[PDB]
Amino acid sequence: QKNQAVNFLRMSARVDAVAARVQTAVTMGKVTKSMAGVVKSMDATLKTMNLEK
Amino acid sequence: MEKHLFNLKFAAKELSRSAKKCDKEEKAEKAKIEKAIQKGNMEVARIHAENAIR
């Protein structure tokens, strides 16, 4: 029982780590998409709003 | 003789109604122009502007 406690708990560690980096990957994804969004909408609204007018 | 009176009044109210339509279409056509030039299309924007005017 005790050595199993060690083994499992170790798996918990490493799997948790990958879980963290995947988390970062997803949130990064959201930020990227949304940012693309603002760059575009702002761009097509920068074409008819171009500074001279 | 009445027949001609009635046709004249009819033609008058006719012209008024058609004028009314063309005007309504005019406003709708302004809107449609704005949607058009929103993309950046300089051709559709043209013939729409034109139809609005006419």
Swiss-Prot record, chain A:
It is found in: Cytoplasm, Cytosol; Endosome; Late endosome membrane. Widely expressed. Expressed in pancreas, kidney, skeletal muscle, liver, lung, placenta and brain. Probable peripherally associated component of the endosomal sorting required for transport complex III (ESCRT-III). ESCRT-III components are thought to multimerize to form a flat lattice on the perimeter membrane of the endosome. Several assembly forms of ESCRT-III may exist that interact and act sequentially. Interacts with CHMP1A. Interacts with VTA1; the interaction probably involves the open conformation of CHMP1B. Interacts with CHMP2A. Interacts with VPS4A; the interaction is direct. Interacts with VPS4B; the interaction is direct. Probable peripherally associated component of the endosomal sorting required for transport complex III (ESCRT-III) which is involved in multivesicular bodies (MVBs) formation and sorting of endosomal cargo proteins into MVBs. MVBs contain intraluminal vesicles (ILVs) that are generated by invagination and scission from the limiting membrane of the endosome and mostly are delivered to lysosomes enabling degradation of membrane proteins, such as stimulated growth factor receptors, lysosomal enzymes and lipids. Belongs to the SNF7 family. This is Charged multivesicular body protein 1b. The gene is CHMP1B.
